[PDB]
Design a protein around this ligand. Structure first.
Ligand SMILES: *[C@H](C)[C@H]1/C(=C/c2[nH]c(/C=C3N=C(/C=C4\NC(=O)C(CC)=C4C)C(C)=C\3CCC(=O)O)c(CCC(=O)O)c2C)NC(=O)[C@@H]1C
Ligand SMILES: *[C@H](C)[C@H]1/C(=C/c2[nH]c(/C=C3N=C(/C=C4\NC(=O)C(CC)=C4C)C(C)=C\3CCC(=O)O)c(CCC(=O)O)c2C)NC(=O)[C@@H]1C
Ligand SMILES: *[C@H](C)[C@H]1/C(=C/c2[nH]c(/C=C3N=C(/C=C4\NC(=O)C(CC)=C4C)C(C)=C\3CCC(=O)O)c(CCC(=O)O)c2C)NC(=O)[C@@H]1C
Ligand SMILES: *[C@H](C)[C@H]1/C(=C/c2[nH]c(/C=C3N=C(/C=C4\NC(=O)C(CC)=C4C)C(C)=C\3CCC(=O)O)c(CCC(=O)O)c2C)NC(=O)[C@@H]1C
Ligand SMILES: *[C@H](C)[C@H]1/C(=C/c2[nH]c(/C=C3N=C(/C=C4\NC(=O)C(CC)=C4C)C(C)=C\3CCC(=O)O)c(CCC(=O)O)c2C)NC(=O)[C@@H]1C
Ligand SMILES: *[C@H](C)[C@H]1/C(=C/c2[nH]c(/C=C3N=C(/C=C4\NC(=O)C(CC)=C4C)C(C)=C\3CCC(=O)O)c(CCC(=O)O)c2C)NC(=O)[C@@H]1C
Ligand SMILES: *[C@H](C)[C@H]1/C(=C/c2[nH]c(/C=C3N=C(/C=C4\NC(=O)C(CC)=C4C)C(C)=C\3CCC(=O)O)c(CCC(=O)O)c2C)NC(=O)[C@@H]1C
Ligand SMILES: *[C@H](C)[C@H]1/C(=C/c2[nH]c(/C=C3N=C(/C=C4\NC(=O)C(CC)=C4C)C(C)=C\3CCC(=O)O)c(CCC(=O)O)c2C)NC(=O)[C@@H]1C
Ligand SMILES: *[C@H](C)[C@H]1/C(=C/c2[nH]c(/C=C3N=C(/C=C4\NC(=O)C(CC)=C4C)C(C)=C\3CCC(=O)O)c(CCC(=O)O)c2C)NC(=O)[C@@H]1C
Lengths: 209, 161, 160, 66, 26, 159, 161, 161, 160, 160, 161
């Protein structure tokens, strides 16, 4: 538009409404919902306990974000608060724990077990069928614990989190298909099975009368 | 997520428009409501445990659900149910402060229905429990606050159903 | 906004909003009316602020408006002013929000990479924002100017 | 099970990181025995130096209870 | 020692007897 | 404090303080003198707050101070009052800090464990704090009272 | 991924056949082309940043996309777009060396359409940007190289559309 | 970490004492200083890159360190050194707001000497760089602010040495 | 192949191919014509190589061709020869590729586990491959034989 | 070097060096004598190369040697030449190593950050290296020049 | 790690010197031996298992070490010992190709002694096993390579002792 200073005219938007917003593609939320936590020895107990709670909530999928006491592991927590072990070594202990095995290994099938491993430690969906096959062969030939040890030992693990950072949800995008997959595993695949076998719920009795 | 202030800003940013008086009026509206909301949020946080207990008594417990075969039967499932109730209450409080329901759509409502269906959690009863919480909350917060509080509870219920 | 930031911190802690966090929200809502006035002033004077700031920037750095420089030529000079206008708009949004979150998502993330492709020098851009602050400060009341200053400073800090 | 107490110092020679990496750089830690051989290798490939190793728990040359 | 509490607590016990009130639902 | 909280978030994100974070510090430091006044009032009236709240508590729960009850006996009664005094001191610390960090570390984390071992009933400690709120609030101006109230409510929530 | 040499080998391995003269001829064909491809790849790598800049200037920038409301509006989105451009360029270079399009299907093309649709990225514009890069690349590499380079760029564009 | 306000509280809590007038006076002293500190912090953040450049020019660059065989030789080492300088500046600013040196001990100072010794980083030169930053900062912040700023820089330097 | 390996390493680093890696590709394309000739020679002589190698292996190890041994009996002996033929085919593929990557997927991964189920002794298999190398080397020119040797050695290393 | 890179990849896989990797080592040692000659030529002509390249760069970009520009003034111009000399020395090391590993550790990692503090413009630096390549190419034989070009190109790519 | 070529480069880089005739001579010395080393490495890799068997037979087994009370008693410890033997062989081969012992320091000798001391692994026997491997290898590799291979085995042994 003539009579209008050119710098104003170049900024104008012809589309107006019906145009994309800041929360359109990746969006603002998933960033800034990600906190790097590092435990410091000096840190106050209230600071330390927020990070410990974050470990529990990533690795055991504690949506509520505050572990129920039976889920906690206390000796490991004391060694972590003493700075005798690293956050990485605490995460390794959690996976070798029995609560891990009952909630995540025993109900699932091995290919789903692997998906849950990468999600729980690593923050992402499995990258490839070749990645799935290696971990499945570990589970079948050696423990659940040996598979837990492999991911934490993995180079990916060591680049993104090293020893100090608590794992976080990261939606990569570097490999192909991983951004979609990691959205589906972190945002839609809420856990949908019961860990316990006993006292199955009857379908009826939906309404409360 | 988005809040009321950011929602105005975002609408103007897609237009590329600087903020104008009409936009400013919407922002002004939020700022008057704000003080009330803060007070309401503190009330809810302090009485959160009570709110859940009352709501469960009103809808969930003394029912077939608690009796054997019911989803809320077994201590593990009872505890899970009150855990979920607490989540919903906390997020509703966040939404009320924000003045926008977006947060509910993002964290609370995502995949919830499908998960519930696979679990066998009864949606209707859950909705009933949300509505029960709303009534209890309404009393505590007081009438002016209650209207604001109600919309977020209603938003959750509609999403779940 | 202040609200968004508070909620996000609470979610991470998995807690209801703390008394201190609630107090911060209360302070923001009280300040809001003043903030709206400050933003309105800058909006009215926008055309002048951009123009004056541009001139100061070009005086500070002859090079950008020179054959070597990126700004050289009418179209390019306009684009450089357009960018300054964009940053001013963002600052106004920031003042009303009470936080740089609006500013940051629209303008400060990926800014280095964008400018590097364009080949625009980032330090010159920062100078233009500093220039804009000086013009804006003169129009604003001293108290208002201080408030506005913080947001301007953040931009300068984010891209330098 | 046996456990090692290990001190090491690791440099970042491939990249320069803005976040505070001091905890990663100097890390005394307790390592299960079965993990140590892998963890030693890892420190060596990074071009870290292993300052000290002591066996915290377990007895040297024990045939059982290991 | 909680001496101030020790004298105030007995003063409170002497002034009023709790062993009859019975809980009230209120 | 407010300061600690702001700095900790910044350090984690490896950044200088936001304009928002700076604003919150400014607001807090302006409020400082008022906060100190609120704390001083409560400190001065400490003995009264504890005692009057104690009396209400014993009326509300006769059982605790009954031969069957845990709190029964003068020594036990003193301890219950001592506890109330401790909690009141904590509240004042919170008010001046403008946040709960001090309160939380000293008095709420691990609290569930300690009282459960003692067998003192927590579904009643909260009531004692509520009681204390009512007394304390009556010695404060309306604006001051509201500020003080938040901190009392936090305690009740945390238990 | 798979390259020309491996592609021949794999085809013979499923048959179980030992390598024969006809197979050898295909391998021989690749080996003559190879030297040219290596030179082209080095050119592209050195001029990569420039190639992207020129292609953006030709298609993406000074457009509605950059103007407010456009998907390349905001620094975050602008930066993401030029990042994707760089990926396409890098993978096309890999494909040209390999002499096989398979790697593009495995690493670039798989899931791209669906991802773009969810994001709201406009495919047509992206394709346009790829075509622009091809033209710029064609100039730099020189004619003999350009023909080889073009097929991989075209393969990407067809996949996206 | 600990701040001035919390430091008073902690000292009274170990005594078990309720807060008293003398304690209140120390708290009051911090509250008057606070406004000045906030202004200083904003100055430092805006001029941070400049401060580091000036300080490096004064002490580190044009020296044997930058010349081959020096610790700051090679781009990787140069970049690491200016990264450390930025850390020191940022933490000193945090300490100045807090009014307490504790955070420096907890995060910056702890393990630094040992790490430096293994790396081969020269402590004396680092200290020199910190002292240089202090002088530059002093100018920017202005005199009243400078006194407060100086003590934290000095605290870092003493810790490192 | 050489190409595949180079690309894969670059992709992991997320970088364009290094000058050194490009040089290696150039060298490989020059070598390729010679490599094709070497492969052709081995293919032509394959039937002879397998037979001669078989004989040597059986002479080297009586046990395999003994009632206890796995190779014992006509069917079993045929299978052992078939295996030798398979490994020779793989070697030829490797020579043209310039790398064992193709060989490795088809022949070296899971080989221990496969043979263990069959109960065939792995060291004997390795001996058979060594035998094949000796025959093959004699047919090849000295320079050609060295190239071929490496690929044969890799197999022997993998089955160990 | 070529050797270092091969060993490092093997060590990561915890395997002995592949036949392909061994072949690449063989090729490199044959190439080495030629490489040494190329490096010697550049070393002898170094003073000239740096000087001529500086000339061209300043001609191509007046701005850097202008009051606004970083290079302006004698001392500054000397430092800019010193930088060019550093990069030339690195390139020679690269040619004998057969890889950019030597170059990369000393010169390409953290380079953006270093130059940004100095405020030197990175694209100009890249131009200087391009200039150096053109001078170097003229002195070198055509085949030698191509080899040298790759290393020069890598630098230009890295400083971008 | 460093190899022969990079050892020279690093030595000149700290001085900031362009490569000179002396440097060029050292590099030439490596280049001329290279082809021999490659051949030796292939021999060792193909015969690796045999080399370890022979070396154990000559120096470790049929002894008190393998018998109860000995460190290589139990399958677990026998397996650990021959695992270590394998690495020593592999790393010595890497060193021989590189023409530099640095890799042995960085990735074998460092922290091995401390681990061994805590375990109680008998050093003399280990060194004996390394020396035994050396003797075996010398035969296989032949005149061209034997001298070169030997020095790296000797370097390992002297590091432990
Ligand atoms: C540029 C020509 C056009 C454009 C691009 C654009 N892309 C995104 C976001 C994403 N891009 C990808 C795509 C890829 N990931 C892969 O692995 C591959 C194959 C190698 C590709 C090509 C992904 C997954 C994302 C999302 C995650 C991320 O940001 O990393 C955006 C931005 C969306 C956002 O909200 O940031 C844009 C703008 N869009 C245009 O306007 C151009 C036409
Ligand atoms: C109680 C009788 C006495 C007491 C105890 C006390 N301990 C700590 C802190 C720690 N306690 C331990 C000890 C262990 N952790 C373990 O896992 C085991 C072995 C199974 C033991 C015995 C540890 C490691 C800590 C430090 C870190 C942590 O909290 O886990 C304290 C708390 C000190 C603090 O402020 O954190 C106390 C009070 N002290 C007494 O007063 C009693 C005499
Ligand atoms: C008796 C020893 C004590 C006592 C009991 C009590 N319980 C309730 C109410 C409920 N108790 C249950 C418990 C269970 N549900 C389960 O699935 C299991 C495990 C198999 C248990 C044990 C439930 C579900 C309820 C809620 C009501 C319902 O059944 O739907 C009450 C009534 C409290 C109320 O207000 O409803 C009481 C009194 N109370 C005591 O004080 C005794 C020491
Ligand atoms: C209470 C009113 C009703 C009820 C609840 C109930 N929920 C579960 C199990 C799950 N609850 C969830 C829900 C969420 N996970 C999330 O991530 C989110 C959103 C972010 C929510 C709100 C999940 C995923 C589970 C599964 C695993 C888990 O417990 O963490 C149960 C237990 C089901 C079981 O068989 O274990 C119950 C009982 N059910 C009722 O009957 C009430 C009407
Ligand atoms: C002026 C201070 C400096 C300057 C600017 C300059 N910019 C361009 C081109 C573009 N600038 C942008 C910037 C933005 N897009 C965003 O989303 C935001 C945040 C809201 C900004 C600030 C964009 C997208 C472009 C690309 C072109 C387009 O808009 O479509 C140019 C011209 C391009 C060129 O390189 O020739 C210039 C000159 N240049 C300077 O050196 C000044 C110091
Ligand atoms: C010339 C092409 C451009 C230019 C160069 C320039 N550099 C400086 C100052 C320094 N340059 C370096 C660089 C290096 N140190 C290293 O370790 C390496 C890798 C081997 C390099 C490349 C350093 C460290 C300095 C700082 C001073 C010092 O060396 O002690 C200047 C001086 C400017 C200043 O000091 O502010 C200049 C001019 N500048 C241009 O504009 C040309 C395009
Ligand atoms: C600059 C004034 C001097 C200089 C610095 C220098 N530092 C390193 C390497 C490291 N520096 C640190 C220090 C910190 N990391 C932290 O988390 C903190 C506290 C917040 C500090 C202060 C660390 C841990 C490293 C190692 C890894 C890393 O990059 O962080 C180097 C590089 C040395 C090397 O070879 O790795 C240098 C050069 N050296 C000088 O000469 C200057 C005087
Ligand atoms: C007999 C069933 C088979 C057989 C045996 C055989 N063993 C050896 C040599 C050794 N055997 C062992 C075994 C053990 N040492 C331990 O610590 C344990 C666990 C408690 C066992 C079982 C050892 C260590 C040796 C090494 C030599 C030594 O005695 O120190 C041989 C000779 C090995 C050689 O190569 O000469 C033999 C023959 N072999 C068969 O064929 C039978 C089926
Ligand atoms: C064999 C010649 C002698 C022997 C070996 C032996 N070693 C161990 C245990 C370990 N060996 C290592 C060593 C390494 N760490 C490294 O990084 C490297 C370089 C690649 C090496 C070689 C380690 C870490 C361990 C401990 C963990 C593990 O078992 O993997 C043992 C076992 C000791 C025990 O008591 O368990 C043995 C027996 N000892 C002898 O008797 C031989 C003389």
């Amino acid at each position: 538009d003539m009579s209008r200073p050119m710098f104003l005219e170049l900024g104008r938007s012809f589309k107006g409404a019906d145009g994309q917003s800041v929360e359109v593609g990746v969006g603002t939320l998933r960033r800034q919902l990600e906190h790097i936590y590092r435990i410091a020895p000096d840190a106050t107990r209230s600071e330390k306990d927020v990070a410990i709670n974050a470990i529990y909530r990533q690795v055991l999928d504690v949506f509520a974000g505050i572990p129920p006491s039976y889920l906690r592991l206390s000796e490991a927590e004391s060694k972590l608060k003493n700075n005798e072990i690293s956050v990485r070594e605490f995460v390794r202990r959690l996976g070798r724990s029995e609560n891990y095995r009952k909630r995540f290994f025993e109900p699932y099938s091995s290919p789903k077990v692997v998906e849950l491993l990468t999600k729980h430690f690593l923050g992402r969906a499995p990258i490839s069928q070749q990645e799935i096959s290696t971990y499945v062969q570990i589970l079948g030939t050696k423990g659940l614990a040996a598979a837990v040890d492999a991911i934490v030992e993995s180079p990916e693990y060591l680049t993104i989190f090293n020893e100090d950072i608590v794992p976080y949800r990261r939606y990569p995008t570097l490999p192909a298909g991983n951004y979609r997959a990691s959205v589906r595993v972190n945002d839609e695949e809420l856990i949908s099975q019961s860990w316990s076998s006993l006292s199955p719920t009857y379908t009826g009795y939906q309404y409360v009368t | 997520m988005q809040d009321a202030i950011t929602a105005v800003i975002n609408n103007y940013d897609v237009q590329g428009k600087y903020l104008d008086g009409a936009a400013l009026d919407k922002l002004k509206a939020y700022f008057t409501t704000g003080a009330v909301r803060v007070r309401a949020a503190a009330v809810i946080s302090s009485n959160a445990t009570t709110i859940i207990k009352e709501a469960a008594a009103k809808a969930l417990i003394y029912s077939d659900l608690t009796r054997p075969g019911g989803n809320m039967y077994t201590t593990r499932r009872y505890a899970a149910c009150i855990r979920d109730m607490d989540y919903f209450l906390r997020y509703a409080t966040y939404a009320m402060l924000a003045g926008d329901p977006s947060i509910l759509d993002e964290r609370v409502l995502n995949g919830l229905k499908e998960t519930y269906n696979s679990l066998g959690v009864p949606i209707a009863a859950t909705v009933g429990g949300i509505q029960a919480m709303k009534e209890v909350v309404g009393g505590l917060v007081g009438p002016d606050a209650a209207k604001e509080a109600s919309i977020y509870f209603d938003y959750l219920s509609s999403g779940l159903s | 906004s202040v609200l968004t930031k508070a909620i996000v911190n609470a979610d991470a802690e998995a807690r209801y909003l703390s008394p201190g966090e609630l107090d911060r929200i209360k302070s923001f809502v009280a300040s809001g009316e003043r903030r709206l006035r400050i933003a309105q002033t800058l909006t009215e004077a926008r055309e002048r602020i951009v123009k004056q700031a541009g001139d100061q920037l070009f005086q500070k750095r002859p090079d950008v408006v020179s054959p070597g420089g990126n700004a050289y030529g009418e179209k390019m000079t306009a684009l450089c002013l357009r960018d300054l206008d964009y940053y001013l708009r963002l600052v106004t949004y920031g003042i009303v929000a009470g936080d740089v979150t609006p500013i940051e998502e629209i303008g400060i993330i990926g800014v280095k990479e964008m400018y590097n492709s364009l080949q625009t020098p980032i330090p010159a851009v920062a100078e233009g924002v500093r220039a804009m602050k000086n013009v804006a400060t003169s129009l604003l009341s001293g108290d208002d100017a201080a408030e506005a200053g913080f947001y301007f400073d953040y931009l300068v800090g984010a891209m330098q | 099970s046996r456990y090692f107490k290990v001190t090491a110092c690791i440099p970042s020679l491939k990249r320069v990181r803005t976040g505070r990496e001091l905890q990663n750089t100097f890390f005394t830690k307790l390592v299960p025995y079965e993990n140590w051989f892998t963890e030693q290798q890892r420190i060596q490939k990074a071009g870290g130096k292993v300052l000290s190793v002591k066996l915290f728990t377990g007895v040297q040359g024990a045939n059982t209870g290991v | 020692s909680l001496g101030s509490w020790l004298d105030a607590a007995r003063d409170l016990i002497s002034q009023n007897d709790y062993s009859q009130k019975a809980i009230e639902v209120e």
